[PDB]
Amino acid sequence: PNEECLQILGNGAKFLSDAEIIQLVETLIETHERGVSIRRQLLSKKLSEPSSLQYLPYRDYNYSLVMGACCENVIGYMPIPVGVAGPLCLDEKEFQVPMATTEGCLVASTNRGCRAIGLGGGASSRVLADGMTRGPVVRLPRACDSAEVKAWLETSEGFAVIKEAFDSTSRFARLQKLHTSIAGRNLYIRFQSRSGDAMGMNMISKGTEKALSKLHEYFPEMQILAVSGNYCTDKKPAAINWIEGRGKSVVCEAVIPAKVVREVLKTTTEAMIEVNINKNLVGSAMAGSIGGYNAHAANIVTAIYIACGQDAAQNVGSSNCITLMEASGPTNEDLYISCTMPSIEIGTVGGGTNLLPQQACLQMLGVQGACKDNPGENARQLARIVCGTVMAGELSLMAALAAG
Amino acid sequence: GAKFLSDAEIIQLVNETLIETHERGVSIRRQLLSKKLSEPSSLQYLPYRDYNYSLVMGACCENVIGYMPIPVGVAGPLCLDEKEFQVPMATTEGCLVASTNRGCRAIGLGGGASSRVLADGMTRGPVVRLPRACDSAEVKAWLETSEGFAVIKEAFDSTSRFARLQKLHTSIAGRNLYIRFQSRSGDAMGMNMISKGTEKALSKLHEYFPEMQILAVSGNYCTDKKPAAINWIEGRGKSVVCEAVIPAKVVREVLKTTTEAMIEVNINKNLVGSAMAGSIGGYNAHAANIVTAIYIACGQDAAQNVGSSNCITLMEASGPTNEDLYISCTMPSIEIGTVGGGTNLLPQQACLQMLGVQGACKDNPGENARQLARIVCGTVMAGELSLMAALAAG
Amino acid sequence: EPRPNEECLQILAKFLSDAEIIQLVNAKLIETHERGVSIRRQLLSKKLSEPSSLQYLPYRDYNYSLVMGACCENVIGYMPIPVGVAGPLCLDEKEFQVPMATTEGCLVASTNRGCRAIGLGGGASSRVLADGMTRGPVVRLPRACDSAEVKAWLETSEGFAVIKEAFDSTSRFARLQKLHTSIAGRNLYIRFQSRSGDAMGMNMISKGTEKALSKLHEYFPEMQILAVSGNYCTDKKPAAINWIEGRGKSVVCEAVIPAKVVREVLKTTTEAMIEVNINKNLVGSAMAGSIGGYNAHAANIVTAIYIACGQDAAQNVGSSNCITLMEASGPTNEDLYISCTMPSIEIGTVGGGTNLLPQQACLQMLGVQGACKDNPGENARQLARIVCGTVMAGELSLMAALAAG
Amino acid sequence: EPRPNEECLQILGNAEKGAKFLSDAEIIQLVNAKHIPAYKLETLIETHERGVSIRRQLLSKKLSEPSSLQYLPYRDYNYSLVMGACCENVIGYMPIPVGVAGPLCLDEKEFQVPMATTEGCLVASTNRGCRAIGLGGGASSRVLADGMTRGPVVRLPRACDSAEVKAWLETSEGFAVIKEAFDSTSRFARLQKLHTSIAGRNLYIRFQSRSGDAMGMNMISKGTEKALSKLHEYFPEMQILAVSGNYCTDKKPAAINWIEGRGKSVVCEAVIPAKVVREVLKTTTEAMIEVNINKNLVGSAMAGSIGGYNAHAANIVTAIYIACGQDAAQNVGSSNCITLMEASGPTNEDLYISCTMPSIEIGTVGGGTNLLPQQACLQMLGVQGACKDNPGENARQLARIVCGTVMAGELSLMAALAAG
Ligand SMILES: CC(C)c1c(C(=O)N(C)[C@H](C)c2ccccc2)nn(-c2ccc(F)cc2)c1CC[C@@H](O)C[C@@H](O)CC(=O)O
Ligand SMILES: CC(C)c1c(C(=O)N(C)[C@H](C)c2ccccc2)nn(-c2ccc(F)cc2)c1CC[C@@H](O)C[C@@H](O)CC(=O)O
Numbered sequence A: 001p002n003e004e005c006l007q008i009l010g011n012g013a014k015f016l017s018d019a020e021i022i023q024l025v026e027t028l029i030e031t032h033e034r035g036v037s038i039r040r041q042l043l044s045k046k047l048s049e050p051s052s053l054q055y056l057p058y059r060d061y062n063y064s065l066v067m068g069a070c071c072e073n074v075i076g077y078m079p080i081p082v083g084v085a086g087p088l089c090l091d092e093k094e095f096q097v098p099m100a101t102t103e104g105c106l107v108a109s110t111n112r113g114c115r116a117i118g119l120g121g122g123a124s125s126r127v128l129a130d131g132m133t134r135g136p137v138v139r140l141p142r143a144c145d146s147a148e149v150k151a152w153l154e155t156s157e158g159f160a161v162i163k164e165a166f167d168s169t170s171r172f173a174r175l176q177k178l179h180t181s182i183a184g185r186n187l188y189i190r191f192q193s194r195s196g197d198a199m200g201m202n203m204i205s206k207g208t209e210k211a212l213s214k215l216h217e218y219f220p221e222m223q224i225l226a227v228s229g230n231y232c233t234d235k236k237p238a239a240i241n242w243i244e245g246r247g248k249s250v251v252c253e254a255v256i257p258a259k260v261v262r263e264v265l266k267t268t269t270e271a272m273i274e275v276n277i278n279k280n281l282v283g284s285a286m287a288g289s290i291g292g293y294n295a296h297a298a299n300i301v302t303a304i305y306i307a308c309g310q311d312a313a314q315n316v317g318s319s320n321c322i323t324l325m326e327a328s329g330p331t332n333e334d335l336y337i338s339c340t341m342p343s344i345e346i347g348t349v350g351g352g353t354n355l356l357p358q359q360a361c362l363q364m365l366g367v368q369g370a371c372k373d374n375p376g377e378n379a380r381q382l383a384r385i386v387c388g389t390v391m392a393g394e395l396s397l398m399a400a401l402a403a404g
Numbered sequence B: 001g002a003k004f005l006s007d008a009e010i011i012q013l014v015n016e017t018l019i020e021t022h023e024r025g026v027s028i029r030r031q032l033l034s035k036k037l038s039e040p041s042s043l044q045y046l047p048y049r050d051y052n053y054s055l056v057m058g059a060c061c062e063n064v065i066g067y068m069p070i071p072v073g074v075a076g077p078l079c080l081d082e083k084e085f086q087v088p089m090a091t092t093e094g095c096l097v098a099s100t101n102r103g104c105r106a107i108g109l110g111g112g113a114s115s116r117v118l119a120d121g122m123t124r125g126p127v128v129r130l131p132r133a134c135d136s137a138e139v140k141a142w143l144e145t146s147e148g149f150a151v152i153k154e155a156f157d158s159t160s161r162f163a164r165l166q167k168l169h170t171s172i173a174g175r176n177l178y179i180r181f182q183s184r185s186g187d188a189m190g191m192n193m194i195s196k197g198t199e200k201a202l203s204k205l206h207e208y209f210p211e212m213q214i215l216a217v218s219g220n221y222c223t224d225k226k227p228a229a230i231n232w233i234e235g236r237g238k239s240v241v242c243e244a245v246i247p248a249k250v251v252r253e254v255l256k257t258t259t260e261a262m263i264e265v266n267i268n269k270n271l272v273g274s275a276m277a278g279s280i281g282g283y284n285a286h287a288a289n290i291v292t293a294i295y296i297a298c299g300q301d302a303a304q305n306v307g308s309s310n311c312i313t314l315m316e317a318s319g320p321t322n323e324d325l326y327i328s329c330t331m332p333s334i335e336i337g338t339v340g341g342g343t344n345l346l347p348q349q350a351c352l353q354m355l356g357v358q359g360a361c362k363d364n365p366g367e368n369a370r371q372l373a374r375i376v377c378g379t380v381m382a383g384e385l386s387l388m389a390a391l392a393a394g
Numbered sequence C: 001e002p003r004p005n006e007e008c009l010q011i012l013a014k015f016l017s018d019a020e021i022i023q024l025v026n027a028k029l030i031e032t033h034e035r036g037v038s039i040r041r042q043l044l045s046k047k048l049s050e051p052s053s054l055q056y057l058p059y060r061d062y063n064y065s066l067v068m069g070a071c072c073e074n075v076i077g078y079m080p081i082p083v084g085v086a087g088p089l090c091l092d093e094k095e096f097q098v099p100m101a102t103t104e105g106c107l108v109a110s111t112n113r114g115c116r117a118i119g120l121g122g123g124a125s126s127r128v129l130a131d132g133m134t135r136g137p138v139v140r141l142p143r144a145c146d147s148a149e150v151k152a153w154l155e156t157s158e159g160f161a162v163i164k165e166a167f168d169s170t171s172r173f174a175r176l177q178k179l180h181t182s183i184a185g186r187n188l189y190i191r192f193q194s195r196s197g198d199a200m201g202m203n204m205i206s207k208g209t210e211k212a213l214s215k216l217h218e219y220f221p222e223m224q225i226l227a228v229s230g231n232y233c234t235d236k237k238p239a240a241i242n243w244i245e246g247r248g249k250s251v252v253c254e255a256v257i258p259a260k261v262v263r264e265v266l267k268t269t270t271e272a273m274i275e276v277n278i279n280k281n282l283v284g285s286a287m288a289g290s291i292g293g294y295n296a297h298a299a300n301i302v303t304a305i306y307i308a309c310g311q312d313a314a315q316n317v318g319s320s321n322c323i324t325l326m327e328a329s330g331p332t333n334e335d336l337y338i339s340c341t342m343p344s345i346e347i348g349t350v351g352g353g354t355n356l357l358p359q360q361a362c363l364q365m366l367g368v369q370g371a372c373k374d375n376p377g378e379n380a381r382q383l384a385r386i387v388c389g390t391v392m393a394g395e396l397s398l399m400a401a402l403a404a405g
Numbered sequence D: 001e002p003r004p005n006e007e008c009l010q011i012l013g014n015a016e017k018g019a020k021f022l023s024d025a026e027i028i029q030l031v032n033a034k035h036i037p038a039y040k041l042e043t044l045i046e047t048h049e050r051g052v053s054i055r056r057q058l059l060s061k062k063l064s065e066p067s068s069l070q071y072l073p074y075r076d077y078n079y080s081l082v083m084g085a086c087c088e089n090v091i092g093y094m095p096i097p098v099g100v101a102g103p104l105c106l107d108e109k110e111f112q113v114p115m116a117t118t119e120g121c122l123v124a125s126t127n128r129g130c131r132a133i134g135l136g137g138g139a140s141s142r143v144l145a146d147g148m149t150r151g152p153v154v155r156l157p158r159a160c161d162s163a164e165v166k167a168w169l170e171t172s173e174g175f176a177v178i179k180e181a182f183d184s185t186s187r188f189a190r191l192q193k194l195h196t197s198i199a200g201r202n203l204y205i206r207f208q209s210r211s212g213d214a215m216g217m218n219m220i221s222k223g224t225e226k227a228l229s230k231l232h233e234y235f236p237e238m239q240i241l242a243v244s245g246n247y248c249t250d251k252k253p254a255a256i257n258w259i260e261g262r263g264k265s266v267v268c269e270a271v272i273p274a275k276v277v278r279e280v281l282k283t284t285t286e287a288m289i290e291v292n293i294n295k296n297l298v299g300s301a302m303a304g305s306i307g308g309y310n311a312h313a314a315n316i317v318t319a320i321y322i323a324c325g326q327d328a329a330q331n332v333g334s335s336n337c338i339t340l341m342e343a344s345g346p347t348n349e350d351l352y353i354s355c356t357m358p359s360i361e362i363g364t365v366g367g368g369t370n371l372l373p374q375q376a377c378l379q380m381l382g383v384q385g386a387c388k389d390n391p392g393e394n395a396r397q398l399a400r401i402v403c404g405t406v407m408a409g410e411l412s413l414m415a416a417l418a419a420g
């Protein structure tokens, strides 16, 4: 049928077959899975190998939370294996850390690092700072004019006006001190604020847009070139994130007894320190690294991020880490280790954390959703878990490299 | 033995290979895990049934408790090098696939994109130590001689069919010597292959310099999974460039902006903005978004998005009336493969097959990985085009 | 003629000869400074493979009184650096004659051409955006939990007030700004920042830092001061922190050069200049992996002015940080807009080499010599503006030379 | 009594008279009336010094304070070597105090190192570092690489075209043609392997070559021009945008210099006995190492440094550079340094120190090294001029002296910081 199909669709789509809808070519089709099915069939005929989609699964997945929220042009889902590393003994608690990865040995190695920490009295961590950022670029007629705006934003009165505009957008919108940089007639303004338990990009962007609108009322000659002028900086390496922080700034530490270094990690404290200095400090320095003073923080960040519904593209900055090691204890034979991660971009509400499987992994760690009594606590706790697990990862890989 | 015993019998015995069957092994491990969690019901919506664990166990993941479904969208057709690609993207970020898809449309109506692979070579950068700086200097000089390099190359190349050692890059720090081994790796990403070659090459170097200590097979000089200027300047894995010209009409109708607006935003965001932020290699809008999405979909090492997303996006006016938009994306360090690791799994192979790059290329070793790298760079450009337009239009 | 060692000891300076004093040094004070230099020169010459090496190194008639125990030790003479003049530099409705000490041919003359282009373009305008010298000590506590506690303490209003009071007590020019702190495990890096009148401020900030750390130690007795400089300042090394946060004076300068002037004086076009600027100073520096080096030769101008005006020339490492921007301007879109932004000019008009008279002569040329009584810091800020303006002149001329080929 | 401008031109125009018969005021009047250019006063007047004197008098009138130049010296200086070579619009000279640090015990030789500075304690502190090295058996150094660079930017119509040029330059045949063109510009020109980087249709080409005992910027730039001209024969659609595209990189901080090297790449080392660390440096080996790790490595890391893993290499580099007629603006990259320290010896109480400097840009011929006072400081170190028997040896020796003196400076300042 050709003309009859248009009449039935006006009434609904359940009476029409799959081949009839394809003949003509989201909201038109009744069920979400059927929409995926038709899209897959249309796609298959465009590929040189239509049987490509055979092993890409799609059936029985809950698309209701994905459509119009997380993904478009959906043709199915990608299963990433999830392993568990733990217990991670952190701040007098014990965590079972979910890790989504396809790299062999990663989960097992991280698990060994956890064991080392666990037999060593446990790890301790602190959140040092919290605030997601957006760094728009604005332009004025002259550099003297951009200078005037910078000076105006630095006054208590000027900042209060911008803060009021920013804070009016959301419950959690609370503008911190502005960071500004001039480049001739350009002005780069770094807006920073806490965002409850959300990663905060949407919240900060909404606050930024309103703040820039209010700024335009005081400086009508100002042009808003882009709401992001890469001064944030989001999803690109930047020294500003390393020095100023972005999202959660975290530190974590543990002391590993000499006995544990030998038995669990198959190495010595002295060997670990020498590798740390010459690989993570000198090596990264020779390579021209900004913020990459670690062995494989990225491995742990990415694995946790994928498992817990985070924005995995943010591993670029979230993996920023300096790993430090020194001799400790009365006999100077125990291993003190610390990991400092100034730019963990993380959340427990919104985005991929709205999906049930991702919520399962968040629930494992007891951080799923918003914390009503203490806004931000779940996201802060997750950041502490990430930093702690990174340290476990550092211990085991460094031990492997030290032992050869 | 264990087949006749019940699930509760194995658990109470404790309170990997014994279970024999894969799924029941995952089931029991989940049950053991549940009693360690504050809420045992946490695992309820973490799926595990009916998944092919045979290719995972002892290869891709350990302590497996299930799988994480990441939604896969499609952006395309991507008109690249006279071909058309349907690009799979695994993401939970709303608007990403749709925005990338709009960028593809702009390129498609603009006559298509053209790309080139400029370099190919995975790297490993061990740190070795000598008694003195004079000694490490001697090793550096020895490695720089034709005969010295030939001996190391012979040892390196003996480890694998695809192992073919390129020119060594060496840096001294006192008595420390950092040696960057580089080689092609067929269609594999190559980390295991390069590491195996490196280990044998260092063993051979130790024959000539017996006082040399191999401190670490990776001294962060590679550099793997950390931001590093060396990857930006020297390249790592695949170095790729891609370009297109977008007609003024297409910029207006599809991208909802102007060529002039796009150029001004690109200069002041991607160049000046990144400069003010102190970026090394981050001269782009969101290359990382596209890299990560393709990487997860195509069984790549997503942790390598750190360096793989290195990108400089350039825009200028083009055409007779100087009103068309020329765009280029240059990505010097795409770390990518079509065999090994996550690319061994069937669902991941499905997305690779969509692009026609699955597995090793028999007739032309490396062609599939090179093609995928070109697709990544091209898709990045599509993403750049759409996001920049969104920012320029406000 | 030469007297025995025992007969020379009973007398000892003016009565003794030069040959006799040398014998006393070899056996194992002087009336004038110059003779003291002469003796040291003679002692040194014998140690050298070529005994007449110091022949053309001048030393006579120089005022060593302001140098000894203040600027240099083990003095064997002076190094004359040729000084040229570039100008007039038309900046902020004033005209400056800029002294430049250099041995690079074409530098002064090229910079002079840049000044000519600015002068025929209606002049330059500049602004000082920030002012504060920094010192970044490293302190260490028993644990990261402890260093975190100190960071939190320093971030409180009452915690900062106590530290500010201690810091500001060391000098009348001291005014401690908001602290920048960074943790690295049990390490804490604290970036102290304050204005310093017309001085570059390193000595002043360090003194304030020591006092502030002493006060902090009263509240945290377990804190170890590892180094008064933990490279977090950062002084005399390249550092993104200086680029992003600023150090000393942060300055911006701008001008519009008419199309006619670009053509006649600079021998190029506005279009060519912009194209070279984008692809050299932005894309080129990006490809090179530069942090803060988004310019043609700011270092040339900074160094030349610094040597001429008694600045710390080693500070050109950070002081030369610059981003040069160019775009089309004017009603016909044919004029050249240029800006230079320099966030970390480390500069002073009192103390160090600026205490010497020849160096003061060059400072007097620009009208910035000494401390401004009416407005503390005004002379140092003015000199910073002159540097940024002269950098822009240098940028115009070299970029034109490169564009024209 | 002053004379009219028309009469003064006839006196100056005459061969048997010149500016000798004209007064200062009459020459001043001729420049102000635009008959005589101010930048050519040295050639037009009988002596160079009077030419400088006239320019000073011209300048003094323009200033708000007419007596500003009073204490800026100019008399009795040899301008003949400066004019048309080192400086323009000369109004005198700036005396920088020169101090001596040493003996520096380096490679079984002893050096007395000249340092031009106005920073109090710098020479004396560096001298203390030398003394520590001397009692420690001396320093050893090695030159690892030698090659000045220039990094032009060229442009092609498309990225596919720039890719083609990159591939062409990477072929043995393509490189041989370019090397032939480059090397034909100077006797010392020996082009090393090219480093190329694409940015869309842009191509950045890093030319590197030894340059005898010269710093080599002019030599390399001349070779680059000829090589690009030859490349343009094969690729006529190529546009040479700039002979320097900041890919060199000259006088700006750049990771490329840190990683690839520029000029002379040098390493130096010494072992200081525990007794010497205690008595001379007023500290301990343990304290030195702890400060070095947390300041020069961790501290510089927290600050986001590329190449600045040291205490004050820039102080030593700048002081030697000014004293020895180097380009002091090149201390930006020349001061790149990583300082390393560890425990050494049978009892693990002695201090091993190393300094690695990948990008020392230095020469002993050309530029400011042509001036006699600067040559005096070069003669002190026995490195003045070109080494005929071994081209580059004098410049290489100076680079080793710089690295060794840096290490001396590092020892002393780090000791001061460790002791408090
Ligand atoms: C983390 C784990 C995946 C691992 C380990 C590792 O930890 N083990 C083998 C130990 C013994 C272990 C113990 C218990 C259970 C399982 C495995 N060793 N390597 C590794 C490194 C360099 C090399 F050349 C070849 C391999 C890798 C790959 C790291 C990789 O993803 C980043 C690495 O490149 C970052 C860096 O160090 O530069
Ligand atoms: C890519 C897409 C996910 C997107 C778009 C976007 O492209 N669109 C909205 C257009 C109109 C579109 C067209 C067709 C279909 C769907 C959507 N706009 N933003 C975005 C940017 C800044 C901002 F403040 C708030 C939002 C984002 C998020 C980018 C984000 O992941 C990296 C970004 O932060 C990197 C950067 O620019 O710094």
Ligand SMILES: CC(C)c1c(C(=O)N(C)[C@H](C)c2ccccc2)nn(-c2ccc(F)cc2)c1CC[C@@H](O)C[C@@H](O)CC(=O)O
Pocket (backbone or CB within 6 Å): C104, C105, C106, C107, C109, C110, C111, C113, C296, C297, C300, C397, C398, C401, D221, D243, D244, D245, D246, D248, D249, D250, D251
């Ligand atoms: C600044 C001046 C000293 C100069 C000029 C220059 O400005 N001129 C020649 C013009 C025409 C001029 C006009 C009026 C009077 C005198 C001279 N041209 N070059 C230069 C550049 C690249 C090159 F390959 C060879 C030479 C240089 C050397 C710059 C140098 O110190 C930093 C430079 O390397 C920084 C960079 O661009 O990378």
Ligand SMILES: CC(C)c1c(C(=O)N(C)[C@H](C)c2ccccc2)nn(-c2ccc(F)cc2)c1CC[C@@H](O)C[C@@H](O)CC(=O)O
Pocket (backbone or CB within 6 Å): C135, C206, C228, C229, C230, C231, C233, C234, C235, C236, D119, D120, D121, D122, D124, D125, D126, D128, D311, D312, D315, D412, D413, D416
């Ligand atoms: C090098 C010397 C000039 C010096 C010394 C120094 O070495 N001494 C005092 C010792 C005891 C000494 C011994 C023998 C003879 C004379 C002097 N101590 N400081 C110094 C450092 C930080 C500080 F807060 C205040 C002063 C400085 C200034 C360094 C300065 O130019 C770069 C420095 O900022 C680089 C850095 O460390 O960040």
